[PDB]
Ligand binder design. Structure first.
Ligand SMILES: Nc1nc2c(ncn2[C@@H]2O[C@H](COP(=O)(O)OP(=O)(O)NP(=O)(O)O)[C@@H](O)[C@H]2O)c(=O)[nH]1
Ligand SMILES: [Ca+2]
Ligand SMILES: [Ca+2]
Ligand SMILES: [Mg+2]
Ligand SMILES: [Mg+2]
Ligand SMILES: [Mg+2]
Length: 166
């Protein structure tokens, strides 16, 4: 069956792990344990196709950049995650995108921009601001909450649908 190798990137604390765990394991991780490099695999049906998702959950932050380079190399699509209550995380996105382009040696990599923590009310990144960034990259913008599950399947499945257009 078809395998989709997805990679989740973005600043520390934005919810990469919580998103992945919610998708794969159907619960919300409330605590914060920084990630080094974790993988999850699960068989799912997406648009009638039985397939295997292989999801790489990466370490966030400029300090782990070198480590990510090699682990990121076989990624077929990337979720670029910021949190809607963390302006710096949004400002950091372009650096993650640039890393992706470096590791894939391509300007045309399947990606989705994800604004996570949309259950929180202390919003400092407005939807339109993120829409505009995504538009510049030619990719979708989707908001998610790993806490409530809002948008979580949509984000990951949309990434699969972007891979399929490549
Ligand atoms: N309210 C709310 N909290 C969230 C959401 N997603 C993650 N969090 C919280 O934010 C914290 C960090 O989440 P985590 O997934 O560990 O972040 P990360 O991006 O994997 N960090 P790292 O790069 O260090 O591994 C946790 O306390 C988690 O519960 C969300 O959608 N809503
Ligand atoms: Ca929990
Ligand atoms: Ca390279
Ligand atoms: Mg993590
Ligand atoms: Mg503002
Ligand atoms: Mg398209």
């Amino acid at each position: 069956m078809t395998e989709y190798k997805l990679v989740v990137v973005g600043a520390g604390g934005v919810g990469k792990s919580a998103l992945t765990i919610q998708l794969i394991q159907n619960h919300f991780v409330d605590e914060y344990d920084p990630t080094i490099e974790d993988s999850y695999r699960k068989q799912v049906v997406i648009d009638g196709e039985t397939c295997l998702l292989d999801i790489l959950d990466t370490a966030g932050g400029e300090e782990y950049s070198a480590m990510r380079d090699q682990y990121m190399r076989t990624g077929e699509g990337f979720l670029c995650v910021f949190a809607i209550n963390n302006t710096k995380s949004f400002e950091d996105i372009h650096q993650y995108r640039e890393q992706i382009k470096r590791v894939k040696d391509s300007d045309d990599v399947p990606m989705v921009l994800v604004g996570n923590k949309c259950d929180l009310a202390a919003r400092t990144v407005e939807s339109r601001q993120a829409q505009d960034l995504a538009r510049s990259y030619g990719i979708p913008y989707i908001e998610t909450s790993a806490k409530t599950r809002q948008g979580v399947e949509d984000a990951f499945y949309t990434l699969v649908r972007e891979i399929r257009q490549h």
